[PDB]
Design a protein around this motif. Structure first.
Motif, PDB file in Angstrom:
ATOM      1  N   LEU A  20      17.931   7.538  29.505  1.00 60.73           N
ATOM      2  CA  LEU A  20      16.806   8.031  28.726  1.00 60.73           C
ATOM      3  C   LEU A  20      16.235   6.970  27.805  1.00 60.73           C
ATOM      4  O   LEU A  20      16.979   6.126  27.293  1.00 60.73           O
ATOM      5  N   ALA A  21      14.921   7.056  27.566  1.00 61.64           N
ATOM      6  CA  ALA A  21      14.230   6.167  26.647  1.00 61.64           C
ATOM      7  C   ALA A  21      13.719   6.974  25.470  1.00 61.64           C
ATOM      8  O   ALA A  21      12.865   7.845  25.643  1.00 61.64           O
ATOM      9  N   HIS A  22      14.214   6.669  24.274  1.00 62.27           N
ATOM     10  CA  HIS A  22      13.701   7.293  23.057  1.00 62.27           C
ATOM     11  C   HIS A  22      12.661   6.419  22.336  1.00 62.27           C
ATOM     12  O   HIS A  22      12.732   5.181  22.368  1.00 62.27           O
ATOM     13  N   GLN A  26       3.063   4.549  21.686  1.00 57.94           N
ATOM     14  CA  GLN A  26       1.915   5.371  22.111  1.00 57.94           C
ATOM     15  C   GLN A  26       0.924   4.680  23.076  1.00 57.94           C
ATOM     16  O   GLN A  26       0.444   5.310  24.020  1.00 57.94           O
ATOM     17  N   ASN A  27       0.647   3.396  22.870  1.00 55.95           N
ATOM     18  CA  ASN A  27      -0.343   2.682  23.700  1.00 55.95           C
ATOM     19  C   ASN A  27       0.362   1.859  24.786  1.00 55.95           C
ATOM     20  O   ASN A  27       0.079   0.679  25.016  1.00 55.95           O
ATOM     21  N   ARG A  28       1.249   2.541  25.491  1.00 53.58           N
ATOM     22  CA  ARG A  28       2.000   1.961  26.583  1.00 53.58           C
ATOM     23  C   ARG A  28       1.223   2.096  27.883  1.00 53.58           C
ATOM     24  O   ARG A  28       0.472   3.037  28.046  1.00 53.58           O
ATOM     25  N   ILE A  29       1.398   1.162  28.810  1.00 54.95           N
ATOM     26  CA  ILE A  29       0.767   1.279  30.134  1.00 54.95           C
ATOM     27  C   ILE A  29       1.729   1.112  31.322  1.00 54.95           C
ATOM     28  O   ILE A  29       1.334   1.316  32.476  1.00 54.95           O
ATOM     29  N   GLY A  30       2.987   0.765  31.065  1.00 53.77           N
ATOM     30  CA  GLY A  30       3.934   0.631  32.157  1.00 53.77           C
ATOM     31  C   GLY A  30       5.333   0.296  31.710  1.00 53.77           C
ATOM     32  O   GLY A  30       5.564   0.015  30.531  1.00 53.77           O
ATOM     33  N   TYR A  31       6.257   0.323  32.672  1.00 47.34           N
ATOM     34  CA  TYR A  31       7.675   0.101  32.413  1.00 47.34           C
ATOM     35  C   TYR A  31       8.291  -0.783  33.475  1.00 47.34           C
ATOM     36  O   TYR A  31       7.864  -0.763  34.632  1.00 47.34           O
ATOM     37  N   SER A  32       9.320  -1.523  33.079  1.00 50.86           N
ATOM     38  CA  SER A  32      10.131  -2.259  34.016  1.00 50.86           C
ATOM     39  C   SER A  32      11.583  -2.069  33.652  1.00 50.86           C
ATOM     40  O   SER A  32      11.954  -2.211  32.495  1.00 50.86           O
ATOM     41  N   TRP A  33      12.390  -1.732  34.659  1.00 49.42           N
ATOM     42  CA  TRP A  33      13.818  -1.604  34.500  1.00 49.42           C
ATOM     43  C   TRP A  33      14.510  -2.752  35.185  1.00 49.42           C
ATOM     44  O   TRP A  33      14.191  -3.105  36.322  1.00 49.42           O
ATOM     45  N   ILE A  45      14.692  -3.950  38.870  1.00 53.16           N
ATOM     46  CA  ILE A  45      15.034  -2.814  39.699  1.00 53.16           C
ATOM     47  C   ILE A  45      13.724  -2.232  40.162  1.00 53.16           C
ATOM     48  O   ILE A  45      13.470  -2.127  41.362  1.00 53.16           O
ATOM     49  N   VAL A  46      12.882  -1.880  39.199  1.00 58.57           N
ATOM     50  CA  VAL A  46      11.608  -1.256  39.514  1.00 58.57           C
ATOM     51  C   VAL A  46      10.594  -1.388  38.373  1.00 58.57           C
ATOM     52  O   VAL A  46      10.935  -1.282  37.208  1.00 58.57           O
ATOM     53  N   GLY A  47       9.349  -1.651  38.747  1.00 58.73           N
ATOM     54  CA  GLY A  47       8.216  -1.680  37.826  1.00 58.73           C
ATOM     55  C   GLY A  47       7.400  -0.429  38.045  1.00 58.73           C
ATOM     56  O   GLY A  47       7.409   0.136  39.144  1.00 58.73           O
ATOM     57  N   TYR A  48       6.695   0.009  37.009  1.00 56.01           N
ATOM     58  CA  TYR A  48       5.966   1.269  37.067  1.00 56.01           C
ATOM     59  C   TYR A  48       4.688   1.217  36.234  1.00 56.01           C
ATOM     60  O   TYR A  48       4.748   0.978  35.028  1.00 56.01           O
ATOM     61  N   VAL A  49       3.545   1.454  36.878  1.00 49.36           N
ATOM     62  CA  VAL A  49       2.255   1.518  36.185  1.00 49.36           C
ATOM     63  C   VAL A  49       1.927   2.979  35.903  1.00 49.36           C
ATOM     64  O   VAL A  49       1.880   3.802  36.820  1.00 49.36           O
ATOM     65  N   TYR A  68      10.864   7.687  36.100  1.00 46.13           N
ATOM     66  CA  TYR A  68       9.989   8.808  35.792  1.00 46.13           C
ATOM     67  C   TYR A  68       8.876   8.397  34.847  1.00 46.13           C
ATOM     68  O   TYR A  68       8.962   7.369  34.189  1.00 46.13           O
ATOM     69  N   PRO A  69       7.807   9.192  34.779  1.00 40.57           N
ATOM     70  CA  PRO A  69       6.688   8.867  33.882  1.00 40.57           C
ATOM     71  C   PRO A  69       7.032   8.703  32.390  1.00 40.57           C
ATOM     72  O   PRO A  69       6.329   7.987  31.677  1.00 40.57           O
ATOM     73  N   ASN A  70       8.085   9.358  31.927  1.00 36.88           N
ATOM     74  CA  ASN A  70       8.546   9.215  30.545  1.00 36.88           C
ATOM     75  C   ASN A  70       9.492   8.024  30.383  1.00 36.88           C
ATOM     76  O   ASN A  70      10.129   7.855  29.336  1.00 36.88           O
ATOM     77  N   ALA A  71       9.610   7.234  31.450  1.00 31.39           N
ATOM     78  CA  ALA A  71      10.347   5.972  31.464  1.00 31.39           C
ATOM     79  C   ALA A  71      11.837   6.120  31.728  1.00 31.39           C
ATOM     80  O   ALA A  71      12.532   5.111  31.770  1.00 31.39           O
ATOM     81  N   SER A  72      12.350   7.336  31.908  1.00 35.07           N
ATOM     82  CA  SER A  72      13.781   7.474  32.207  1.00 35.07           C
ATOM     83  C   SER A  72      14.070   6.974  33.613  1.00 35.07           C
ATOM     84  O   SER A  72      13.208   7.052  34.496  1.00 35.07           O
ATOM     85  N   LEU A  73      15.265   6.401  33.792  1.00 31.04           N
ATOM     86  CA  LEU A  73      15.691   5.867  35.086  1.00 31.04           C
ATOM     87  C   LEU A  73      16.902   6.635  35.568  1.00 31.04           C
ATOM     88  O   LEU A  73      17.925   6.710  34.884  1.00 31.04           O
ATOM     89  N   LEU A  74      16.729   7.268  36.720  1.00 28.89           N
ATOM     90  CA  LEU A  74      17.773   7.988  37.403  1.00 28.89           C
ATOM     91  C   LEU A  74      18.369   7.044  38.418  1.00 28.89           C
ATOM     92  O   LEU A  74      17.646   6.496  39.259  1.00 28.89           O
ATOM     93  N   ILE A  75      19.685   6.871  38.352  1.00 21.79           N
ATOM     94  CA  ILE A  75      20.407   6.163  39.397  1.00 21.79           C
ATOM     95  C   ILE A  75      21.353   7.155  40.055  1.00 21.79           C
ATOM     96  O   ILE A  75      22.179   7.777  39.366  1.00 21.79           O
ATOM     97  N   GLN A  76      21.221   7.304  41.379  1.00 17.51           N
ATOM     98  CA  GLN A  76      22.018   8.272  42.149  1.00 17.51           C
ATOM     99  C   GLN A  76      23.113   7.609  42.948  1.00 17.51           C
ATOM    100  O   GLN A  76      23.060   6.405  43.229  1.00 17.51           O
ATOM    101  N   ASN A  77      24.102   8.417  43.316  1.00 23.10           N
ATOM    102  CA  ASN A  77      25.208   7.956  44.120  1.00 23.10           C
ATOM    103  C   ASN A  77      25.780   6.654  43.568  1.00 23.10           C
ATOM    104  O   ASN A  77      25.814   5.636  44.257  1.00 23.10           O
TER     105      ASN A  77
END
Ligand SMILES: [Zn+2]
Length: 107
Positions: A20-22, A26-33, A45-49, A68-77
Motif C-alpha cells: 500500500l501507498a499512503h 495530489q498532482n501526481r501523473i504516474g507511478y513506478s515500482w 517492475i512496472v510503470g503506470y500512467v 492499481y490506480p491508487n498506486a498499490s502493488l499486488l504481488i501474487q504467488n
C-alpha cells in the motif's frame, strides 16, 4: 510523507502481498515500482500512467505483479526470492517526484 505498507508483512509462500501507498501527492501523473531499495530502471517492475491507465512492465516484471490506480502493488504467488525491498516512485506533473520503500518477508 509518502510511505509504503506491505500487507501482510509476513507472507506464506504461494500467497499474495499487497503493497500500500499512503499519502500520495495530489498532482501526481504516474507511478513506478522497483525491486530493491532504489529507483533503478533495470529493476523496474512496472510503470503506470494515470491519465491513460497504461501499465508498462519489465525488466523485473515476472508474471505476477499488478499495479492499481491508487498506486498499490499486488504481488501474487510469492516465492522465497521475493523476500526483500520494493521502492515506489510517484511522478508529479511538475516532476518534483517522491519515492518510498518498501519491505516484506516470505516464509
Ligand atoms: Zn525467512
Amino acid at each position: 510523507k509518502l510511505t509504503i505498507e506491505s500487507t501482510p508483512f509476513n507472507v506464506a509462500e504461494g500467497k499474495e502481498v499487497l503493497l500500500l501507498a499512503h499519502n500520495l501527492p495530489q498532482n501526481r501523473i504516474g507511478y513506478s515500482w522497483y525491486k530493491g531499495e532504489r529507483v533503478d530502471g533495470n529493476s523496474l517492475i512496472v510503470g503506470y500512467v494515470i491519465g491513460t491507465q497504461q501499465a508498462t512492465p519489465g525488466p523485473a516484471y515476472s508474471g505476477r505483479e499488478t499495479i492499481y490506480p491508487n498506486a498499490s502493488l499486488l504481488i501474487q504467488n510469492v516465492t522465497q526470492n521475493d523476500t526483500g525491498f520494493y521502492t515506489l516512485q510517484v511522478i508529479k506533473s511538475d516532476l518534483v517526484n517522491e519515492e518510498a520503500t518498501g519491505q516484506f518477508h516470505v516464509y
